[PDB]
Design a protein around this motif. Structure first.
Motif, PDB file in Angstrom:
ATOM      1  N   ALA A   1      43.370  39.638  47.737  1.00  0.00           N
ATOM      2  CA  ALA A   1      43.496  40.950  47.065  1.00  0.00           C
ATOM      3  C   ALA A   1      43.920  40.836  45.609  1.00  0.00           C
ATOM      4  O   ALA A   1      44.828  40.043  45.262  1.00  0.00           O
ATOM      5  CB  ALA A   1      44.474  41.850  47.784  1.00  0.00           C
ATOM      6  N   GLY A   2      43.269  41.609  44.749  1.00  0.00           N
ATOM      7  CA  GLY A   2      43.625  41.692  43.349  1.00  0.00           C
ATOM      8  C   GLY A   2      43.109  40.505  42.552  1.00  0.00           C
ATOM      9  O   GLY A   2      42.142  39.857  42.970  1.00  0.00           O
ATOM     10  N   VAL A   3      43.745  40.273  41.381  1.00  0.00           N
ATOM     11  CA  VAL A   3      43.307  39.237  40.477  1.00  0.00           C
ATOM     12  C   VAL A   3      43.210  37.900  41.191  1.00  0.00           C
ATOM     13  O   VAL A   3      44.193  37.429  41.787  1.00  0.00           O
ATOM     14  CB  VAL A   3      44.224  39.102  39.257  1.00  0.00           C
ATOM     15  N   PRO A   4      42.073  37.185  41.088  1.00  0.00           N
ATOM     16  CA  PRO A   4      40.820  37.621  40.485  1.00  0.00           C
ATOM     17  C   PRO A   4      40.040  38.531  41.436  1.00  0.00           C
ATOM     18  O   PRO A   4      39.791  38.153  42.593  1.00  0.00           O
ATOM     19  CB  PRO A   4      40.081  36.307  40.270  1.00  0.00           C
ATOM     20  N   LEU A  69      52.886  50.033  37.393  1.00  0.00           N
ATOM     21  CA  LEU A  69      52.239  50.249  38.678  1.00  0.00           C
ATOM     22  C   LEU A  69      50.782  49.726  38.654  1.00  0.00           C
ATOM     23  O   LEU A  69      50.328  49.101  39.597  1.00  0.00           O
ATOM     24  CB  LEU A  69      52.314  51.703  39.113  1.00  0.00           C
ATOM     25  N   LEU A  70      50.054  50.019  37.556  1.00  0.00           N
ATOM     26  CA  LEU A  70      48.704  49.487  37.438  1.00  0.00           C
ATOM     27  C   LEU A  70      48.706  47.968  37.489  1.00  0.00           C
ATOM     28  O   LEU A  70      47.897  47.338  38.155  1.00  0.00           O
ATOM     29  CB  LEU A  70      48.028  50.002  36.153  1.00  0.00           C
ATOM     30  N   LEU A  71      49.616  47.342  36.721  1.00  0.00           N
ATOM     31  CA  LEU A  71      49.714  45.898  36.716  1.00  0.00           C
ATOM     32  C   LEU A  71      50.081  45.360  38.096  1.00  0.00           C
ATOM     33  O   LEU A  71      49.468  44.386  38.565  1.00  0.00           O
ATOM     34  CB  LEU A  71      50.719  45.430  35.673  1.00  0.00           C
ATOM     35  N   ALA A  72      51.084  45.952  38.728  1.00  0.00           N
ATOM     36  CA  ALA A  72      51.562  45.422  40.026  1.00  0.00           C
ATOM     37  C   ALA A  72      50.454  45.453  41.058  1.00  0.00           C
ATOM     38  O   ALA A  72      50.322  44.518  41.852  1.00  0.00           O
ATOM     39  CB  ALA A  72      52.793  46.174  40.483  1.00  0.00           C
ATOM     40  N   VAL A  73      49.686  46.555  41.133  1.00  0.00           N
ATOM     41  CA  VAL A  73      48.643  46.596  42.150  1.00  0.00           C
ATOM     42  C   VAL A  73      47.510  45.608  41.829  1.00  0.00           C
ATOM     43  O   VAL A  73      47.013  44.890  42.685  1.00  0.00           O
ATOM     44  CB  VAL A  73      48.137  48.008  42.420  1.00  0.00           C
ATOM     45  N   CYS A  74      47.148  45.491  40.525  1.00  0.00           N
ATOM     46  CA  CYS A  74      46.104  44.542  40.172  1.00  0.00           C
ATOM     47  C   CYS A  74      46.509  43.096  40.450  1.00  0.00           C
ATOM     48  O   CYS A  74      45.634  42.273  40.748  1.00  0.00           O
ATOM     49  CB  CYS A  74      45.666  44.741  38.712  1.00  0.00           C
ATOM     50  N   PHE A 356      39.535  44.832  36.247  1.00  0.00           N
ATOM     51  CA  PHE A 356      39.962  46.234  36.361  1.00  0.00           C
ATOM     52  C   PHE A 356      38.797  47.059  36.910  1.00  0.00           C
ATOM     53  O   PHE A 356      38.321  47.985  36.239  1.00  0.00           O
ATOM     54  CB  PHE A 356      40.478  46.780  35.013  1.00  0.00           C
ATOM     55  N   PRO A 357      38.334  46.767  38.133  1.00  0.00           N
ATOM     56  CA  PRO A 357      37.211  47.503  38.712  1.00  0.00           C
ATOM     57  C   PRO A 357      37.637  48.906  39.088  1.00  0.00           C
ATOM     58  O   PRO A 357      38.782  49.240  39.368  1.00  0.00           O
ATOM     59  CB  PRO A 357      36.902  46.709  40.000  1.00  0.00           C
ATOM     60  N   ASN A 358      36.618  49.787  39.191  1.00  0.00           N
ATOM     61  CA  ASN A 358      36.784  51.124  39.716  1.00  0.00           C
ATOM     62  C   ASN A 358      37.435  51.022  41.105  1.00  0.00           C
ATOM     63  O   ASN A 358      36.881  50.328  41.991  1.00  0.00           O
ATOM     64  CB  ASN A 358      35.397  51.754  39.791  1.00  0.00           C
TER      65      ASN A 358
END
Ligand SMILES: OC[C@H]1O[C@@H](O[C@H]2[C@H](O)[C@@H](O)[C@H](O[C@H]3[C@H](O)[C@@H](O)[C@H](O[C@H]4[C@H](O)[C@@H](O)[C@H](O[C@H]5[C@H](O)[C@@H](O)[C@H](O)O[C@@H]5CO)O[C@@H]4CO)O[C@@H]3CO)O[C@@H]2CO)[C@H](O)[C@@H](O)[C@@H]1O
Ligand SMILES: *O[C@H]1[C@H](O)[C@@H](O)[C@H](O)O[C@@H]1CO
Length: 363
Positions: A1-4, A69-74, A356-358
């Motif tokens: 999950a997430g990056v990458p 929050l955006l950073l943490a989830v990504c 940063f996908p939709n």
């Protein structure tokens, strides 16, 4: 999950960086650094908060919670996300939108209307909750989707001007006589519309582009937007009409609409802005211009570089885009001022590297 994420944007480049494995390592190291510096339990009510830097005494603004929050989830940091969100929820105002300004000791500031909300912060928090719903699911400690649905309805009710669909800069002020182009998040609004079924958000997106179309009468073909303006694209009284530390974000939010949705208005606007910056090149970006392009400040910093790299995604010149990626990585602000620019740097790096996908797409 997430990056990458390993996703491909449906329009434009997948990434403007080379050698993905090295990019991924870079992103994770920059995230560990940002987390170390920016996240604290002190003054966080039992939870976690995003603190600003020494220059403002380690206060919190709601904007920083949205960024965090955006950073943490990504970066697939669910326990951290949840603690950050508990701090947000401990700061929802009477309209269900976050207090914009809290001191380091967890007191809402009273001299500057700290109890009122800032629309860009809550829009970013809401988007982050959609990512959390889609990435992790909502059956755990926090029901991300319910929280998102509540926040989006409060955003619409209080932060959209009825009738005109003009985005307001807060829950309790502005609209047609004063708004902030850098808050305009058409891609976020299209996600809200699809996620919630509330199609009125599409009209907010369209109105944002109409306001920038008015700005084009006054920006001399540069693509630069003012920090603040009216719905007619004219100066807002008492507020900056220059391209400074607000306006810098416009190219980022707008380019995402092109990558996610193929919006040709977004491409037109971002191409113009990128072309303006191509005059001086990547190393020549500075931290203030009039909207006609006249330099008014001459610092080269992380508040301005990554957003131009983001705008470059829409395709004016992909060689210039690669140069802008490299400059975004290379310029990292010193820590006394380490909150704002280095947060925009990491957010824009997520986007321009294909991370940063939709959140409504296949992740
Ligand atoms: O009077 C009207 C109304 O005000 C309400 O309060 C507003 C308040 O007036 C706004 O300032 C606030 O806006 C926040 C936005 O969420 C956010 O985008 C923005 O972000 C700041 C960032 O936090 C800050 O670090 C950054 O600083 C740079 C400086 O601009 C540069 O000069 C300097 O060199 O470098 C630093 C960075 O190191 O600037 C950005 C961009 O401005 O600012 C706010 C968050 O900090 O929103 C409030 C709520 O709407 C009030 O609630 C009402 O009661 C009142 O009627
Ligand atoms: O915005 C800050 C600039 O980024 C910095 O280079 C200068 O020293 O101070 C400005 C105001 O705090």
């Amino acid at each position: 999950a997430g990056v990458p994420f390993n996703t491909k944007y449906p329009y434009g480049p997948t990434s403007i960086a080379d050698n993905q494995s090295e990019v991924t390592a870079m992103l994770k190291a920059e995230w560990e650094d940002w987390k170390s510096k920016r996240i604290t339990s002190n003054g966080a009510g039992g939870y976690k908060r995003v603190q600003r830097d020494a220059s403002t005494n380690y206060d919190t603004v709601s904007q920083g919670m949205g960024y965090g929050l955006l950073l943490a989830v990504c970066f697939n940091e669910q326990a951290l996300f949840d603690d950050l969100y508990r701090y947000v929820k401990s700061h929802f105002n009477g309209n269900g939108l976050m207090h914009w300004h809290i001191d380091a000791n967890n007191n809402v500031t009273s001299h500057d209307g700290g109890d009122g909300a800032a629309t860009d912060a809550d829009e970013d928090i809401a988007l982050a909750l959609i990512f959390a719903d889609k990435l992790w699911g909502s059956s755990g400690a926090i029901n991300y989707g319910q929280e998102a649905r509540t926040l989006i309805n409060n955003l619409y009710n209080h932060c959209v001007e009825h009738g005109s669909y003009v985005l307001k800069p807060g829950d309790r002020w502005g609209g047609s006589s004063v708004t902030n182009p850098s808050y305009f998040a058409p891609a976020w609004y299209k996600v809200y519309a699809q996620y919630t079924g509330d199609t009125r958000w599409n009209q907010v997106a369209d109105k944002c582009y109409q306001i920038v179309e008015e700005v084009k009468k006054y920006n001399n073909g540069t693509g630069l937007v003012p920090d603040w303006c009216t719905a007619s694209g004219t100066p807002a009284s008492g507020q900056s009409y220059d391209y400074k530390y607000d306006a810098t974000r416009y190219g980022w939010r707008t380019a995402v609409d092109y990558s996610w949705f193929g919006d040709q208005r977004a491409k037109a606007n971002c191409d113009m802005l990128t072309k303006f910056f191509a005059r001086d090149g990547a190393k020549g970006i500075v931290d203030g211009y009039t909207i006609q392009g006249s330099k008014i400040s001459n610092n080269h910093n992380a508040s301005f570089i990554g957003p131009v790299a983001a705008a470059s995604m829409t395709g004016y010149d992909l060689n210039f885009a690669k140069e802008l990626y490299r400059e975004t990585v290379a310029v990292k602000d010193s820590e006394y001022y380490g909150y704002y620019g280095n947060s925009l740097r990491l957010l824009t790096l997520l986007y321009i590297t294909g991370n940063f996908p939709n959140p409504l797409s296949d992740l």
